[PDB]
């Protein structure tokens, strides 16, 4: 099968075991921005569902299929590969919808649908959009779509922007310096300090931040799910040419993504941007091994290359240079092994952001 | 191989990938109680190591081997199945101990040692002692132990005691009751509430607590590593009879463990008790889906049964009843997937 070919067995076992837990379904369902936006996108575009045949790829508990049913769908085929397909079947029965929602356990690449559908719905976005590689299963499912059928979501936008965060960068060496001591209980650990530094820099950072750490307007890479093919996501090349709005040390690239539900009545947008309410996707930041000094007006150019791997993730290659100086930096990161840094605190703005006296603005 | 037979491939890949990260070695090493206690147990029993041949099972970074070398060991075979073995080799060279510490990559069940050893050292304890099933690898390595050989640690004591903690129960109960809603965005989830409760309470809770919440003296189950067999840990039956010291609701059983280094000079203990300084093992609590009400003087009896699974952990079955009232609780927990509550 297409899925087994591109996926290692061990990775698939852990993956679908995770999604078999009701607690993980709850976590996603309780993301109000996520679940609420999907409901609005479907119900406000009721003409795209009224008396239509629907395919729900990776339905989980089936919540998106119930929204399609609320919109008037005649038949909904809810495909799910984890053992959550059982729990979804129970929900379909308890909600008296067995005549309109058919749960099909198994992988969308391996099951059979009795007919073609008018619209496909799914929530295939991982963090940084592409993690988990479920977008390819979502695109694979277009083999069941009628010629003029729609897809919810319809397009996806990944945004990249350079950031400055001296604390984040320096924290990598503070952690690795554990190994830079000559007598840890009598053992010199210093020979491993470089390996520790390497290990931390291969990890993307999943958390949030104040948008004022961004040093340039974002660049946008768009995937059109109506047109894209599975193979388009095996190698994702994202060139960028950032025109610096602020002067400082560039420590890496920040990533967020938006999706759009282009319906007949309206287009609904789901955004994970740092300017929007926090979602369970947060944002993702990839450090440079060495910071790049840029002054306002300079151009930071380079490429972000994502190479899919058989662990349902991507190997990230980032290269960037300040054109005016030729100073270059790079990094290689494993999208599958990010560091979850979120603490729950409100992100602090970069120092040096006060342009008027804060003391004069006490009491307002 | 013995390991591959009792271990699923997808579990071993993830398991040894986890221990290949230097950050995880740092987490264990920085546990000063664990690392300091291991060192003192070895150095104070230097006669058990002086000019002896040592096997280190799962040496990781090799820290325990360096302690054995400090104690005067003549030769130390440091077996490690993760890619951490390469980092340990770097430390052996950089510490100028290539003549005394030999890193042997691979599983202790699939490798070949050039000779037998006088003492085996290891840190194979997981959460609730038995998680990860590395105790069986530690016992398996006895194939290389000399008749008169020793084991560091020598014995392991797992302790059980009933606790009361209404806050912990209501946290887990409230989470599961998410699936009691009849109209989540207009969808009736209530049919899955029973399944949700089963799932959430299948998770043992890893964190620390005060001895005050314990309602009776602990019961102890001992594994003597000198004389136990690999197969002895496939099915672990822990009967208990708790004489309640306080009245109230029993919300479950709390677990912790001690290990003892029975050396020739002295015996040194490493404790994860809730009355002792915190270690990276914390303590473990298995909640009842429904608490049992007990009076002071009552007896809470039952059995905690651990059945090893092919994911390098145990399916836990805890059955308990208040003898005076016949109120019974039956629970099944997955030791592999605990809830880490420590904030």
């Amino acid at each position: 099968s297409v899925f087994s070919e591109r996926t290692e067995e061990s990775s698939a076992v852990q993956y679908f075991q995770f999604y078999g837990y009701l607690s993980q379904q709850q976590n996603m369902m309780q993301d109000y921005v996520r679940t609420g936006t999907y409901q609005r996108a479907i119900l406000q575009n009721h003409t795209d569902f009224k008396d239509k045949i629907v395919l729900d790829v990776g339905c989980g508990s089936g919540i998106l299929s119930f929204f399609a049913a609320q919109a008037g769908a005649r038949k909904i085929y809810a495909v799910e590969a984890s053992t959550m397909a059982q729990h979804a079947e129970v929900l379909v029965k308890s909600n008296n919808l067995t005549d309109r929602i058919v749960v099909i356990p198994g992988k969308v690449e391996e099951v059979s649908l009795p007919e073609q559908v008018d619209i496909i719905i799914s929530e295939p976005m991982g963090y940084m959009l592409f993690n988990e590689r479920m977008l390819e299963s979502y695109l694979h499912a277009k083999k069941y779509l009628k010629p003029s059928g729609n897809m919810f979501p319809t397009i996806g936008d990944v945004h990249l922007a350079p950031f400055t965060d001296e604390q984040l960068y320096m924290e990598q060496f503070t952690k690795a310096n554990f190994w830079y001591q000559p007598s840890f209980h009598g053992v010199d650990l210093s020979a491993l300090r470089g390996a520790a530094v390497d290990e931390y820099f291969r990890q993307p950072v999943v958390d949030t931040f104040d948008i004022r750490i961004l040093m340039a307007k974002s660049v946008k890479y768009t995937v059109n799910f109506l047109e894209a093919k599975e193979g388009d996501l095996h190698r994702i090349e994202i060139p960028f040419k950032f025109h610096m709005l602020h002067s400082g040390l560039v420590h890496g690239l920040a990533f967020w993504f938006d999706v759009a539900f282009i319906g007949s009545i309206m287009t609904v947008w789901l955004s994970t941007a740092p300017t929007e309410p926090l979602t369970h996707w947060y944002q993702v930041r990839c450090l440079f091994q060495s910071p790049l000094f840029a002054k306002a007006g300079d151009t930071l150019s380079g490429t972000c290359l994502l190479i899919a791997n058989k662990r349902q993730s991507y190997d990230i290659s980032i290269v960037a240079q300040v054109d005016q100086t030729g100073s270059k930096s790079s990094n290689l990161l494993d999208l599958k092994n990010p560091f979850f840094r979120y603490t729950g605190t409100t992100p602090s703005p970069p120092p040096g952001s006060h342009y008027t006296s804060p003391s004069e603005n006490m009491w307002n | 191989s013995v390991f591959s037979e009792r271990t699923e491939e997808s579990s071993a890949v993830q398991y040894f990938q986890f221990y290949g990260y230097l950050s995880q070695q740092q987490n264990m090493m920085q546990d000063y109680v664990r690392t300091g206690t291991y060192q003192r147990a070895i150095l104070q029993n230097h006669t058990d190591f002086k000019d002896k041949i040592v096997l280190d099972v799962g040496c990781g970074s090799g820290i325990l081997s360096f302690f054995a070398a400090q104690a005067g060991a003549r030769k130390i075979y440091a077996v490690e199945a993760s890619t951490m073995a390469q980092h340990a080799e770097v430390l052996v060279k950089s510490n100028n101990l290539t003549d005394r510490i030999v890193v042997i990559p691979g599983k202790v069940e699939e490798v070949s040692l050039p000779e037998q050893v006088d003492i085996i050292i290891s840190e194979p304890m997981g959460y609730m002692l038995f998680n990860e099933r590395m105790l069986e690898s530690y016992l398996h390595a006895k194939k290389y132990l000399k008749p008169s050989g020793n084991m560091f640690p020598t014995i392991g004591d797992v302790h059980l005691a009933p606790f009361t903690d209404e806050q912990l129960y209501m946290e887990q109960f409230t989470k599961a009751n998410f699936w009691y809603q009849p109209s989540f965005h207009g969808v009736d989830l209530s049919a899955l509430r029973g399944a949700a409760v089963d799932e959430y309470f299948r998770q043992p809770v890893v964190d620390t607590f005060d001895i005050r919440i314990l309602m009776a003296k602990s019961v102890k189950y001992t594994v003597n590593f000198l004389e136990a067999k690999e197969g002895d840990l496939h099915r672990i039956e822990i009967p208990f009879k708790f004489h309640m010291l306080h009245s109230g609701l029993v919300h479950g059983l709390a677990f912790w463990f001690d290990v003892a280094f029975i050396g020739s000079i002295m015996t040194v203990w490493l404790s994860t008790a809730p009355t002792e300084p915190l270690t990276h093992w914390y303590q473990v609590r298995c909640l009842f889906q429904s608490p049992l009400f007990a009076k002071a003087g009552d007896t809470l009896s039952g059995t905690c049964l651990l059945i090893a699974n092919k994911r390098q952990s145990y399916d836990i079955s805890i059955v308990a009843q208040v003898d005076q009232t016949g109120s019974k609780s039956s629970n099944l927990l997955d030791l592999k997937n605990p809830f880490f509550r420590y904030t």
Partner: peptide, 12 residues
């Protein structure tokens, strides 16, 4: 690996 353990992150 954090991704193998949790593809999707926890939102309080």
């Amino acid at each position: 690996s954090t991704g193998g353990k949790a593809p999707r992150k926890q939102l309080a």
